[model samples]
Each structure stands twice: as structure tokens, then as C-alpha cells.
Target chain A: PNIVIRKGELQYKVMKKNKIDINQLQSMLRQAGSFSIQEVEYAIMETNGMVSVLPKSDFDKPTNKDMQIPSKSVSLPITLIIDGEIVRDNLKEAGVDEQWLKQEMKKKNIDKTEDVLFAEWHKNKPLYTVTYEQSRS
Target chain B: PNIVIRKGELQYKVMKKNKIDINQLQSMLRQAGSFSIQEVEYAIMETNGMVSVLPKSDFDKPTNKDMQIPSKSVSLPITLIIDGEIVRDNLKEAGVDEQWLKQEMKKKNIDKTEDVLFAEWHKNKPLYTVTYEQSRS
Candidate 1:
């Protein structure tokens, strides 16, 4: 198993690049000329949703490299969230050991070792979220 | 690359197993059924207006096998009429050789090759529609 730690900024960048239209929060913040109560709440919600779909690695590699799944009809966002559930459930349903995911996440540094806030699959997409510690912040 | 084909009834089974809801289209179709226009057009559109992103080889691969280009976002029922303009434009953008598609159709012994009303790529999803001559008649 391998452990990979992705930079927190990359997470934000990818979300923006995907045209998620976080403009609602942006507009609220702009109106206040600062982080408003509503804006902060909105940001948290948006981050929470996006973080739920963050991938364990940015670059393709051995462990995390070739894990993309395809759908015949479903959208990508929903696919990741659902697939994550399937992966977790199937493993448990099959009576697989927790070490299976633990080792895999470790190789991608997805386990607690990676300082991730949330670690799960979203819409058939592999994702991980990291905490912004003081030094990194 | 290995290729395999699984046959099934209407596309609903695969979609349901993936936990997708076609309620929107079902509603639309039900409405359309009551209208003067008796014929209903069903299609699946790919992400960002691209037609045929992954090759046939890619689409036929087993689910567990990792894919190379993992899409970030996708919208469905993007799913609609086979707009001639969009079809032509996407084919041009994809540089999908019509000959290759035709050849594949031949290999599969697909009788409706020439009647293919729509072929699309939604991010990496591939969906196609055919107008059965008998039904059209």
C-alpha cells in the first residue's frame, strides 16, 4: 500500500476548474465586503459537499493510478458519491477485512495518516480531504 | 484491450443497478405520449458536448479494470433529441471515424447500423440510439 498527501490548494483548484459555480457564496461575501455569517455557512456547505468527492490522488500512479470507473447514464458527481458507498458496502458485505481499505488508503495516504478531514468515495470517484493545519494555513 | 458485450433488455436494468433514476425522462415521455406526436426520441448526451470520448475498447472493458481519463463532472438526460447539428459538430470535434464506427457495427452484426439516429459521449459515457426501420414505418 502507498500513502500520498495532496496539497490542500489543489483540491480548491480542481473544484473551481470543474465550473461548480460557487459564485453564490462569492456574491454573498462581496455584498458584505467580508465573510458574512451566511457566506461562511455557505462556504462550509460547499466545502463539505466538494470534500466528499475529493480524490485520494491528483496524479495517476500504481495504487491510485488507474481507478476511474465509467457510467452508461449517470452523471459524474452522483457517480462518485454512490460508487464510494458501493465500494465501502461491497467490501463489508463481502466480509473483507478493514485492513484492505486501510492499506490502500495508506498507500495513497488517505487513512488518518494523511490529515484528511473526510475520506470516502463519491459518485464512483475516489476522493480525500485534508485539514489545513497552522503551518500549512 | 479486451472487449466483451453484455446483452440486456431496455437500458433500465443497468441504470437501476447503478442507482440512477430516469424519472425525469419517464415523465417527459409520458407527457409526450399524450401529445399529438406519438413518436418519442430517447438519447444520452455526454459531458461538455463531446461525442464518443472513449474508444469502443474502453467502453467494453470490465468495470474493475481502471480507466485512464477519469472525468470530473457530468450532466445527464443531457439526454434528449439527437440534434443533427450537435451530432455533426461533436463527431467533427472527436475526429471519430465514421468508418470505424460502421466497421464496429458490422463486427457486432448490429442490423441497425445505418439507422443509428444518435451516438454520444458524455464525458466517458457512451450511449447510442437507433431508429428501427419497422417502427419508423
Candidate 2:
């Protein structure tokens, strides 16, 4: 009886052609230090050890049930200051300056740049900062 | 007496150039059918009401303290089964079919495909399923 399995066909082929169990194949890849998996809509392992992938399409909208609250968006927050050291390149790239920070520090009673342990800038929100005193005590 | 402020320069420019308060500017944009903020490394507002953005670069790595748990990765999870329906397109693309699923179900005693309420596929993990009985009670 020919049982036509659609999904496992690729794995079956690879396993049969290579004469290796799926676990063994995976182990071999891991041992070779070339094993990595990318989450994608679809992927296939070719006989040549090359894998192909299909990313989720933009049109594939998530259903109501799948949507997370405070839905995560694709954006990275900028670090303006870290460990009391101003990221000058980032600040300049963000089109602000030390003068501006000086004023913000005064308003927040931050005292000085050296007192700031961390600072982040986000859209539509005031600069977020953590001071050394706040962290130490 | 000198007061140094670090943040709010971008907002100040955008507001002053347009002669509107922050709240008013936000409200006006919303009313005009335009308002959304993307988390970016940098963004600028021009006189023409157009925005320019600078996305995060690979060189911009977050510090140890700033890294979130389950840190943001480039991979996205697979939606194996959605709302009791097997995503056949994704299954076919993934090179697995009903026959393979039948075997998997038999191994897990799933009995019938109609009994499945949801299923998710993950790398290096067995197929996860939520049965109608499991979901209901």
C-alpha cells in the first residue's frame, strides 16, 4: 500500500537518500558547527546541504486571536547615554547635542552627565534616564 | 544662570517650526488622518510635513543591561494550525502532509484532524497541538 504523505516527503527523501536517520542528520550538522534554524513561513533542505526559505508575506495579517496586547512593532529604541558616557555619535545622528542634555539634566535634577547611569530616547516620549544615585541606593 | 536641557530638541523644532504645542500637533496630525511613531535610531521632521528616519544598524548593539530576555531575534514563529484549521499552504510548503500528520497524530492518539483546535510547529521540537477536548475543558 502506497501511503502518500505530503509533508514528510522531503524529510523522507533526504533521510532515504543519505541513508541516515533524521536525528543522525541533525547531529551531524550540529557536530559540523553549521547548524542554525531561522523561523520562516516555509523552508526546505536540499540534498546539497543548502536550505531554502520563504518568509511570511506582508499580506498575511494576523487574526484577532493571534494579536498580542501592546502588539510588538518593528522598532529599536536609541541609547543616548550609557554608564554616564554620552553616545556622541548617536546623539549627533539623532540631531541633538550636549547643550540639550545639559538642560534636560537640570530639569530632571540629574545634576550632571556623570551622574546619569543610562538614558534612552523613544518616539513621542520624554527622554528616560536612570541616575547613579537611583541605582546605587 | 544656565539651564542645560538634553532632550526635547526634535519635538521643539517640529513644534516651533509649525507654531503648535505638542498636544496640538499630535491632535492635528490625528485629525488630518496621519499619526504613527516608528521606533527608530533617528528621525527628523522637515518643513513639508514629511518625516525622515534612520533605522538601527548592526553596529548599534544594546549594552548588557539593556538587552531584553528572550532577546529580540530575526526569526518569527510558525503558525502551524490556526483556529482549528491546518494551514495546508504552509504544510505543503513545509513539505509535510496529512499522511505524515496522521502518523504523528497516531503517535499522540489524536484520532482525527477535526479534533484539533490549534497546532504550532517549532524548530527542534515536536509538533504542538491543542485538541477540541483539551481546549474546551
Candidate 3:
């Protein structure tokens, strides 16, 4: 898997550190990669904005059990077309659901859907393709 | 932030559909950016390991309480000189302590010290870097 770093955010954090201790911290960061699990906890809010603890177990299973049932809409390999050209094909293997998608967009700070040119998923792999719109001033 | 997928030991559990909506579920997953935090919980061994919950507000306040500290070390930025030619200088940041180092390493899944070819960090951003080894097989 290729790790893509957002240039702006990377620069911001680096600037926050007094002395980077570049080599030493880099070594530690490398170690973080070896851990079998990494947990991120987020506060979940209801429609009225009341927050609650969503059990870690709720996220373990796919939310799309309905897709497995008989329905008029057959589950086809999700295809993402950009400007009439096929950009992403067969993205269903990436597990996707509403609560997860909403939280993801918030975490990534994705504001506009139009800015997202393409996105697909496989079981657990969510691939995003964005368009270069404007440069930061 | 680079969203890396967690390909750890996986298990499934069934729940009532009333708890969550199917369409919303698919939507949530489509937007998920990184590895599933829930997967990491499954890897913990209570007898040999430990788990605890802390208030998020507590993190905002720093503490000087005595605690078990892990082994830690620092490395100078790798400077390769071929035929007396310096190739790189001041490569990346160094960690202040071992726990921070280990947390960073495990989060990123870094294996051997020699495998860490390069590393970087931004202000308060989770440190990022490249390693000679891969976290997942």
C-alpha cells in the first residue's frame, strides 16, 4: 500500500515541533508501522447532536446486510466514472456504509462532493481520486 | 494523513438490523479513509497485555506522574558517503522518549531499525516515514 502524505498538513505539524530530532522520531514513526492494531476513537452524535459511545464491536461487521437479501437492485461491482471515463472499477470489496462515510469525510475535512472526482472500495480499502481545483493562497 | 488499511486477524458478529440502517451503512464505509480501528482491538491479549479507557480531556492536560517507561534510543540521520561524497543530511526528526517511539513504530508497523530508510513528522501530526520493510505480509 502506498502512503500518500498531504503536503500542507505535513508542513504544519513539522513547524509545530521545536526541534524535530529528525532521525530519532523517524525511527519511532517507523516502529508505529509494526503495531498489529491502531485505534482511533471519535465522538458519535445523534440527529439532535447528543453524543454517545458507539461500541467498538458495531464497526467490526459490515453494515450492508441488506445487500445480501433479494432486491430489485442487484449488487454489481461499483464503477466510478469521471467525465464519462471509467476511473474506478470494482470497488465493492471495500467495506462502505453511511455512518462510516460521514465520519470519514469529516476526518479528512472533505467539504464538497464535487471536489471528489472519484472514490471506490474493496472490503476495507477505500480509494479516493480527487481533482486539482485551486491552489492555496 | 495517509490512510493505511489494517489487514489484521478478522472475525465476524451478527446484530439486529434495527440498530443501523443498511443504506447508511454502505455510505459510511465508502468514505472510510484509514485502517479499521476496531480490528486492532481484536489483536490484544488481556492476560499478556492491557487495555484501559481515558477521558479525551485528560489528554489535553500533560502529567508528570511516574510510570513504566520502555527502552528507547536515538539515531543520527543516515549520511551515506560514497567515494567521500555526502548523499543526504538532516533526514528527519528524533523522538524524545521510547514510549513515543514505540507507539509511532507500531502505529506504522515498522520492523527492524535497519529497515527504517527514511522518516518525517509534521506539527502534532502522526509521524510519517518509509521503511525498508512492510507491516503486512
lDDT of each: 0.35, 0.52, 0.33
Q: Taking the tens digit of each residue's C-alpha lDDT, what string does model 3 give over B76-130?
A: 4432222222224422233244455456667777643455555554444455555
Q: All candidates' TM-scores? A: 0.21, 0.34, 0.18
Alpha-carbon runs more than 4 Å astray in model 2 = A1-10, A17-73, B1-137
Lowest summed lDDT window (length 10), candidate 1 chain B: B1-10
Give candidate 2's error at residue A15 in angstroms.
2.8
Model 3 residue B133 CA deviation (Å) reads 30
Docking class of 2: incorrect
What digit string (tens of lDDT, one per residue) describes model 2 on residues A83-116?
6789878797777888989999998987879887
Off by over 4 Å in 1: A1-22, A25-137, B1-86, B111-114, B121-137
Which DockQ values do the candidates obtain, in the order shown? 0.02, 0.03, 0.02
lDDT of 3 at B132: 49
